[PDB]
Amino acid sequence: AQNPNCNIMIFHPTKEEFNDFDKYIAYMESQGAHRAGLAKIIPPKEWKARETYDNISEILIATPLQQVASGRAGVFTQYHKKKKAMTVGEYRHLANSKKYQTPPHQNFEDLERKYWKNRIYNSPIYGADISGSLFDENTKQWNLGHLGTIQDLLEKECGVVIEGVNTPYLYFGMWKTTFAWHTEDMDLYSINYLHLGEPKTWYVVPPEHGQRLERLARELFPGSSRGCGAFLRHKVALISPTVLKENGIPFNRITQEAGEFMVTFPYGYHAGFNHGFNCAEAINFATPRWIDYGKMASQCSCGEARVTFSMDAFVRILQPERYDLWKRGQD
Ligand SMILES: O=C(O)CNC(=O)C(=O)O
Ligand SMILES: [Mg+2]
Ligand code: NI
Ligand SMILES: [Zn+2]
Known part of the structure; x- marks a missing residue:
């Protein structure tokens, strides 16, 4: 079994290897990258995302969000x-x-x-x-x-x-x-x-150990856990590396710098923070290996998680038993 300790792997594709995105994801998985929940991909030196960032200042942030914390320094x-x-x-x-x-x-x-x-x-x-x-x-x-x-x-x-x-x-x-x-x-x-801009630090739990993080989270956030059987879908809870180590939760950490890609894998719990002013772009994607994870994904039906239009069909087709309850949470 490749990468049995679930370490975060770093890849350096050549320009030729950078042509076929699906093929390269499958390659990284062949080397065990998914076992970490997170991988870094450094693009070939020939590649660039765009010519310059000199003309982005007029983009509008219609609803900036002030992130107000409650709790203790390692658990909030x-x-x-x-x-x-x-x-x-x-x-x-x-x-x-x-x-x-x-x-x-x-x-x-x-x-x-x-x-x-x-x-x-x-x-x-x-x-x-x-x-x-x-x-x-x-x-x-x-x-x-x-x-x-x-x-x-x-x-x-x-x-x-x-x-x-x-x-x-x-x-x-x-x-x-x-x-x-x-x-x-x-x-x-x-x-x-x-x-x-400035870096982004990531923390990640291997997918095979995700339920250990969920069990800790229920212990640390006991009111939230009673409110919802999938409350991490609310995307509000933080637990520090020190607290994770005290409770024996397997995880890894890595810092992403400008010009680098990160891939998160199905059911890889992640969290992190920005070092300073930066701009990132991100999107979800699927591969054939995802389908089984999609069929088993937890869902928030309490009303808090509220998500995109396009998740409707994924629930409806992959999780028909859960669909009616989940949709009630959406409405
Ligand atoms: O960059 C961020 O704030 C959060 N991004 C992600 O969780 C991601 O790319 O999956
Ligand atoms: Mg602009
Ligand atoms: Ni994410
Ligand atoms: Zn919920």
């Missing part, structure tokens, strides 16, 4: 307070202000220590989940706006034609902006490209 939830719209140029200036800028630090490990010590005492503002793309239309390799759609994959594997679309999302971050512990909708893959 966050809620998202909506703020007034602002442009990317306005947001960049805010991220670089004395109130929000990255503190002086020695290295990534020092900054990680400062994040876990101090995150809860601040409320950073995240421009998340913005439909759009920064890939040039002429970029033919690993262009996250030109991937095969999940609807087409389900149709190819299972024969059923379904409604829905699959487009990318932009994330504009600042110091301390945080992504809570989650797997993807319907335990899909994700791919994330860091277009510009």
